[PDB]
C-alpha cells in the first residue's frame, strides 16, 4: 500500500532523517494557520494524493501569503487532482501539506526497491534528481548507482559512503548521505517497505541534505506485523471496488474495455483477458475469484464487475477450485436472477459436472450461454457485444 507524502515525512522524522517543516491540513483554516507556525514565507502547499506529477498538474505551489495558502486549500480540498499518474478521474485531495520553502542548491535521487532479479533490497542514487528516474535509467544509466543490502549483515555504512562518493558528495555531505542511507535502509527493513523514493533528495544552499519529497510503498503482505502502517491506509486513494472485492476475497482491477471477465486464478484471469482481446474483445476488468466460488462470492463478483456501466457482457471462466462445476452454475443462475444481470453471460466451466452445470445453464432460459471451450467462450462473448 501507498502512503501520503506527509506520512512518509512523519516516518522520516521518527528515524531522524531530514525533511521540511510542515503540517498536513484538512481545512483552509488549518492550512493558513500552518504558515504562521512554519515561520516566514514563502510556503509550499501540496495536495496529498498518492500519484506523482502533482506539480505539473498544479497541485503543488509556492505561495508568499496566508491569503494564497487558504485559496489553494479551498480550491483543492474535496476535489480530485488528476495527474499523469492517475486515471482521468484523479484522486481526492483531503489533506494539503503546508511546509517551509527550501533553498535548493542541487537535486539528487535516492530510492530503494526489492530487486526481483538479484533477490535483494537495492538502493539506488543518482545526481539526476527532480526527474522521472525511469528515464534517467534509460537515457543515462551510468548516472545511476546501486548497492544491494546484504541480508546477512544489514545495511552497512560503506554502502552509503559508496553511493555518496559516486554522487561526488564531499565533506559533511558524505556523512549526511550515509546517515540517510542507513536510516532509510532501516525503515525499509523494519517497516517491511516495498518502496522508497526520495525525489528530490536535496542539497540545500545552506549545504545540507534534506528530503524534499518522499514516496513510500509498504509490502501489503507484511501489514499484519506493521500496525502503524496498517492504520495509515487511505482508501479514498484507491478504486473503491478494489477494497470491496478484497473484503469479499476477490481481486479486482478495473479496465477500459466492455467485456467483464470473472475467472478463478490470477494467471487464468490474465490469459482469459488476453484471449478475449485476441478475438477482437476488450476486457473491462480483471477479477480473480479462486476456490471458494460460493453463490454469494460469485454474486459479489457480479455486482463488482457490473458496477461499471460500460460492461456489455460478462465472461465467466472457471477451472477447478473447491466447488463442483454445477453448484457454480446454480450460483450464477441465482446471481443472474437476483442481481438481475442485464447482459449476456457466457460461462466456461471445467471440472466436476462441467456439463450437468453447462446443462443447468442452458436449461435455465436466462440469457446465460455455456461455451464449448476457451477460444469458443472467447468468440461467443466477443460476439455478444458486437455493436452495443
Amino acid at each position: 500500500m501507498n502512503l501520503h507524502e506527509y506520512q512518509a515525512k512523519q516516518l522520516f522524522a521518527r528515524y531522524g532523517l531530514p525533511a521540511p517543516v510542515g503540517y498536513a491540513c484538512t481545512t483552509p483554516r488549518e492550512a493558513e494557520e500552518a504558515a504562521s507556525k512554519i515561520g516566514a514565507g514563502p510556503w509550499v502547499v501540496k495536495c496529498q494524493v498518492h500519484a506523482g506529477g502533482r506539480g505539473k498538474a498544479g497541485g503543488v505551489k509556492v505561495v508568499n501569503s496566508k491569503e494564497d495558502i487558504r485559496a489553494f486549500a479551498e480550491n483543492w480540498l474535496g476535489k480530485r487532482l488528476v495527474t499523469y499518474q492517475t486515471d482521468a478521474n484523479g484522486q481526492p485531495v483531503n489533506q494539503i501539506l503546508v511546509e517551509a520553502a527550501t533553498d535548493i542548491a542541487k537535486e539528487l535521487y535516492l530510492g530503494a526497491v526489492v530487486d526481483r532479479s538479484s533477490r535483494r533490497v537495492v538502493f539506488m542514487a543518482s545526481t539526476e534528481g527532480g526527474v522521472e528516474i525511469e528515464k534517467v535509467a534509460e537515457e543515462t544509466p551510468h548516472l545511476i548507482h546501486k548497492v544491494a543490502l546484504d541480508p546477512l549483515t544489514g545495511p552497512m555504512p560503506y554502502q552509503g559512503r559508496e553511493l555518496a562518493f559516486k554522487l561526488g558528495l564531499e565533506g559533511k555531505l558524505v556523512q549526511q548521505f550515509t546517515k540517510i542511507f542507513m536510516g532509510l535502509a532501516t525503515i525499509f527493513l523494519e517497516r517491511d517497505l516495498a518502496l522508497i523514493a526520495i525525489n528530490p533528495l536535496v542539497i540545500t544552499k545552506q549545504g545540507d541534505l534534506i528530503c524534499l519529497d518522499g514516496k513510500l510503498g509498504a509490502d501489503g503482505n507484511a501489514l499484519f506485523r506493521q500496525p502503524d502502517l496498517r492504520e495509515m491506509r487511505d482508501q479514498s486513494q484507491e478504486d473503491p471496488r478494489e477494497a470491496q472485492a478484497a473484503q469479499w476475497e476477490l481481486n479486482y482491477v478495473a479496465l477500459d474495455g466492455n467485456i467483464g471477465c470473472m475467472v478463478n486464478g490470477a494467471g487464468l484471469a490474465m490469459g482469459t483477458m488476453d484471449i478475449v482481446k485476441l478475438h477482437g474483445g476488450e476486457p473491462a476488468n480483471f477479477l480473480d475469484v479462486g476456490g471458494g466460488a460460493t453463490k454469494e462470492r460469485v454474486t459479489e463478483a457480479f455486482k463488482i464487475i457490473l458496477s461499471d456501466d460500460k460492461v456489455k457482457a460478462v465472461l465467466v471462466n472457471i477451472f477447478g477450485g473447491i466447488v463442483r462445476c454445477d453448484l457454480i452454475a446454480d450460483g450464477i443462475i441465482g446471481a443472474v436472477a437476483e442481481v438481475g444481470v442485464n447482459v449476456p453471460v457466457v460461462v466456461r466451466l471445467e471440472g466436476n459436472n462441467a456439463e450437468l452445470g453447462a446443462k443447468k445453464l442452458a436449461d435455465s432460459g436466462l440469457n446465460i450461454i455455456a461455451a464449448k471451450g476457451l477460444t469458443d467462450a472467447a468468440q461467443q462473448v466477443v460476439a455478444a457485444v458486437e455493436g452495443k
Binding site: 526489492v114 532479479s117 499484519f224 486464478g265 494467471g267 490469459g271 484471449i275 480473480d288 476457451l374
Partner: protein
C-alpha cells in the same frame, strides 16, 4: 520426471489445519506417499491415519521423509520453512500465500546456502502424473507423459495440462513455481531440471507480467536447453503498476511487460503461442 516420483515420502507442516487436511486427503488418494505431518502441540496424535508430530525433526527422524509440504499461515511461514531446512528436509513445497517479501528474501538465501529446494511459496504445486502429487491441483486431467511444464500460474497450468493430455502428449512433471516476486525456485532452476530429464521431451514455459525471470530464462534456454520449448505469457492487456492478483503480477517502472517476455523468448527460439488455446497445438509442431 523431476522433483518428485512414486518414492518421494512427504510430511505436511500445518497438517491438522483446514487446507493441510484437505489437500493431504487429496495427495493421499492420489497415491502420494504422505508419511505424516507436523503440528506444534499435536505431536503424538494421528490424523488421516498418519502420524502427527510436534517438530519437523521428530517427523524426519520417525519417517525418513525428505520432502515437506507447507500449509502454515503467512505469519508463521518463515519459521516453518526454516524449521524444515534445519530438520534435514531437502524439498519444500510452500503453498502459503501472503508471505512477506522480506521473509522470502531471507528464506531464499537460506535455501540456497543450505542446498535445499523450495517450490513456492504462493500456491505452487508439483505433480508427476502417475507417481506423485503434492499440491492443490486436479490430477484427473493429467496423463503420465512427455511434456514438462513450468508455470507462475496455477490455473493457467491446468489449461496446458489438459491440452497436452488431450493431444495425448502427456506430462513428465508439472511445476508451479508460485506467484510471489521472490520464489524459492524460478524458471532457470526448473528448466535445467527438464533439460536433464530423459522423460521430458518438450517443455511448456508459462510466464506472466513482472520481474525479468522469463527474459533471464529465455537467455538460459537459448544456450543450455536443447529440448523444444513452447512458451505463453499472460497479461498482455494488464495495466502497469497494478497488482494482477499474484503478488508478483505487476509491471514496475514500465519493465516486465507481457510483450517484452514474449519477445525475449521468441529471440531465443521459443514457440510462443499467442493464445493459451494453441499450446497443445504448438507442441504438436516442434514435437
Amino acid at each position: 520426471s523431476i522433483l518428485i516420483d512414486k518414492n518421494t515420502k512427504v510430511i505436511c507442516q500445518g497438517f491438522t489445519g483446514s487446507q493441510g487436511t484437505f489437500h493431504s486427503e487429496q495427495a493421499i488418494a492420489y497415491g502420494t506417499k504422505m508419511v505424516g505431518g507436523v503440528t506444534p502441540g499435536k505431536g503424538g496424535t494421528t490424523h488421516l491415519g498418519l502420524p502427527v508430530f510436534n517438530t519437523v525433526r521428530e517427523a524426519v527422524a520417525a519417517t525418513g521423509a525428505t520432502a515437506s509440504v507447507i500449509y502454515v499461515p503467512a505469519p508463521f511461514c518463515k519459521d516453518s520453512i526454516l524449521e524444515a531446512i534445519d530438520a534435514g528436509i531437502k524439498l519444500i513445497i510452500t503453498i502459503t500465500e501472503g508471505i512477506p517479501t522480506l521473509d522470502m528474501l531471507t528464506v531464499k538465501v537460506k535455501l540456497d546456502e543450505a542446498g535445499v529446494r523450495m517450490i513456492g511459496p504462493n500456491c505452487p504445486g508439483v505433480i508427476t502424473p502417475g507417481e506423485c502429487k503434492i499440491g492443490i491441483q486436479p490430477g484427473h486431467i493429467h496423463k503420465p507423459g512427455k511434456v514438462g511444464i513450468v508455470s507462475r500460474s496455477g490455473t493457467l497450468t491446468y489449461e496446458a495440462v489438459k491440452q497436452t493430455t488431450d493431444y495425448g502428449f502427456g506430462q513428465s512433471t508439472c511445476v508451479g513455481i508460485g506467484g510471489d516476486p521472490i520464489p524459492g525456485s524460478n524458471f532457470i532452476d526448473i528448466l535445467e531440471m527438464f533439460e536433464k530429464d530423459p522423460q521430458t521431451e518438450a517443455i511448456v514455459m508459462i510466464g506472466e507480467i513482472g520481474g525479468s525471470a522469463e527474459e533471464e530464462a529465455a537467455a538460459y534456454i537459448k544456450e543450455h536447453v536443447t529440448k523444444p520449448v513452447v512458451g505463453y505469457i499472460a497479461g498482455v492487456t494488464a495495466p502497469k503498476g497494478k497488482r494482477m492478483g499474484h503478488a508478483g503480477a505487476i509491471i514496475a517502472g514500465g519493465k516486465g511487460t507481457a510483450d517484452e517476455k514474449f519477445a525475449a523468448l521468441e529471440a531465443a527460439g521459443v514457440k510462443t503461442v499467442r493464445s493459451l488455446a494453441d499450446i497443445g497445438e504448438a507442441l504438436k509442431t516442434v514435437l
